[PDB]
PDB file of C-alpha atoms (C1' of nucleotides) in Angstrom:
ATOM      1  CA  UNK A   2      90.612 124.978  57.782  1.00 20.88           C
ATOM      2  CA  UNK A   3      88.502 125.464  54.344  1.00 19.72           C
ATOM      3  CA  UNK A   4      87.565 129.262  53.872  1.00 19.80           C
ATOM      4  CA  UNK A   5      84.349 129.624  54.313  1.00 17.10           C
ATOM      5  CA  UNK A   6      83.034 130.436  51.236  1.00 16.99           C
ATOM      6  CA  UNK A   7      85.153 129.717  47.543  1.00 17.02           C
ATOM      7  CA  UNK A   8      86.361 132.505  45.607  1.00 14.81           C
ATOM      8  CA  UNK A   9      83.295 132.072  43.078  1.00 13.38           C
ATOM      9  CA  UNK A  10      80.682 132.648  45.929  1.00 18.23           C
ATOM     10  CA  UNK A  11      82.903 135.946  46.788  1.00 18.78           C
ATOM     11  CA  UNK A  12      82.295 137.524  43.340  1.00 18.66           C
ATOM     12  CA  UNK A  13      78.487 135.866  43.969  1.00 19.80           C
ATOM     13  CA  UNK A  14      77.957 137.920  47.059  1.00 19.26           C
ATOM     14  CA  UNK A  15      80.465 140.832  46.875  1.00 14.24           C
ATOM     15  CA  UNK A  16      77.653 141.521  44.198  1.00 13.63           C
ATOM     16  CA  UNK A  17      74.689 140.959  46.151  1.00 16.21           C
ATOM     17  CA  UNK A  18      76.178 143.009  48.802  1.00 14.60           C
ATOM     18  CA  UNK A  19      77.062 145.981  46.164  1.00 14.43           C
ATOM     19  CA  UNK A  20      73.231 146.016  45.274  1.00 16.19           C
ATOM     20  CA  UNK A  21      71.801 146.185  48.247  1.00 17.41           C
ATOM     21  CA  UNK A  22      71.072 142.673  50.328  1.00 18.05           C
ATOM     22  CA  UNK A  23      71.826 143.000  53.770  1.00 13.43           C
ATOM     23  CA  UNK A  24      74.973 141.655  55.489  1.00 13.56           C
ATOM     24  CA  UNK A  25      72.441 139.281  57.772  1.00 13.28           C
ATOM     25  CA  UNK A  26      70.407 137.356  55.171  1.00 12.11           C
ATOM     26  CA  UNK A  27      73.457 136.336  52.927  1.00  9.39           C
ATOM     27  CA  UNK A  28      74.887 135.561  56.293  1.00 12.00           C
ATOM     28  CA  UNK A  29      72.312 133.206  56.453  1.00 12.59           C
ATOM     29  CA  UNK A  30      71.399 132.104  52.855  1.00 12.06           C
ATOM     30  CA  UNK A  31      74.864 131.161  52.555  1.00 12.19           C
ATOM     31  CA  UNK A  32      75.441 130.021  56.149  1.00 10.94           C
ATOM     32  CA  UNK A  33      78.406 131.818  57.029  1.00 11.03           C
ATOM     33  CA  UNK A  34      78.570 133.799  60.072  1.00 13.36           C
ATOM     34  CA  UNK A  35      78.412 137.675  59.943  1.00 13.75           C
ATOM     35  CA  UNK A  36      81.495 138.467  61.518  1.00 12.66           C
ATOM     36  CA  UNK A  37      83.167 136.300  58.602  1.00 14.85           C
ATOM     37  CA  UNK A  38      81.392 138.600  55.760  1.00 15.36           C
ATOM     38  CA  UNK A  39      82.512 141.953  57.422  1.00 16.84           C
ATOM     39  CA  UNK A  40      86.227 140.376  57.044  1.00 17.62           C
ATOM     40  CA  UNK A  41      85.695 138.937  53.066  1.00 17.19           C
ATOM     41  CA  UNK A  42      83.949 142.587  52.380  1.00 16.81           C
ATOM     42  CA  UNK A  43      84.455 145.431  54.803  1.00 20.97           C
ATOM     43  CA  UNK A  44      81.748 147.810  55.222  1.00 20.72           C
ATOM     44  CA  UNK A  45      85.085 150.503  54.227  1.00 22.85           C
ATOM     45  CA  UNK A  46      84.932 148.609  50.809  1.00 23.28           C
ATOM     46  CA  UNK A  47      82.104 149.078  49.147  1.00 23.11           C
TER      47      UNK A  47
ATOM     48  C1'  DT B   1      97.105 114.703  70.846  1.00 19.76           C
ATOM     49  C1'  DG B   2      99.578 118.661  67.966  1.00 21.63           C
ATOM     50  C1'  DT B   3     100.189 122.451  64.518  1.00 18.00           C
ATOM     51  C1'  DT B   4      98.339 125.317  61.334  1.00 18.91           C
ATOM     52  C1'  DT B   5      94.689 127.947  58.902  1.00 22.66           C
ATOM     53  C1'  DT B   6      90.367 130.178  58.790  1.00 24.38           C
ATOM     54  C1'  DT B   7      85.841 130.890  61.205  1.00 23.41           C
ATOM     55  C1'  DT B   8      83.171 133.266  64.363  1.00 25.59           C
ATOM     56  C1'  DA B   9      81.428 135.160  68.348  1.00 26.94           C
ATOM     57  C1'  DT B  10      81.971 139.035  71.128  1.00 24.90           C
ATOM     58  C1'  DA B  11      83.154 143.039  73.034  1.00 24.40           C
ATOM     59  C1'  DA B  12      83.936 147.741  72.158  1.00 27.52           C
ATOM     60  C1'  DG B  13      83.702 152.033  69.314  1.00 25.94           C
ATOM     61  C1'  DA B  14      87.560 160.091  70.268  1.00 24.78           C
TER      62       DA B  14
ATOM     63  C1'  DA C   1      68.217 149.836  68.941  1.00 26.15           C
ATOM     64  C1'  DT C   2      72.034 149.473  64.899  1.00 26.98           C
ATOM     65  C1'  DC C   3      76.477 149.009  62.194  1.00 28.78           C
ATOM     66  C1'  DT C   4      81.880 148.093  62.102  1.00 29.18           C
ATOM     67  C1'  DT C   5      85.892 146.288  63.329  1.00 28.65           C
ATOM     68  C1'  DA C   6      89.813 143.801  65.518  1.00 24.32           C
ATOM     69  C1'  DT C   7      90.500 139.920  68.491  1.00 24.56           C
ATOM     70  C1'  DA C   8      90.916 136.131  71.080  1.00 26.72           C
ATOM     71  C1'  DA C   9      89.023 131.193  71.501  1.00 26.99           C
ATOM     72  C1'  DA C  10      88.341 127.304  68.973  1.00 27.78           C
ATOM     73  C1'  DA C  11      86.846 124.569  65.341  1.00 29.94           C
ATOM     74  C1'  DA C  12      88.043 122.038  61.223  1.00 32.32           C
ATOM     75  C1'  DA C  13      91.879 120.041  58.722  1.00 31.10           C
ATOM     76  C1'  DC C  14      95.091 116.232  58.519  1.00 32.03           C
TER      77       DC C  14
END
DNA sequence: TGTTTTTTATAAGA
DNA sequence: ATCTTATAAAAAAC
């Protein structure tokens, strides 16, 4: 099955996420489900 | 109708 | 409420 998001997005987002945005909207934006996110980009990560 | 890969909800957190 | 995380069920591929 195709990840859900390609590794361009990742550097996209693990931005985003390093700025701020919360987990929930990017979830959404992007439509990828929250549990997914907390696996690309553990909260322990940041 | 079957295997594999990744998603994703969901339940649980000295 | 909330936030994290591992998992167990299943979708998405072909």
């Amino acid at each position: 099955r195709p990840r859900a998001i390609n590794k361009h997005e990742q550097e996209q987002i693990s931005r985003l996420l390093e700025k701020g945005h919360p987990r929930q909207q990017l979830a959404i934006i992007f439509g990828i489900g929250v549990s997914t996110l907390y696996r690309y980009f553990p909260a322990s990560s940041i």
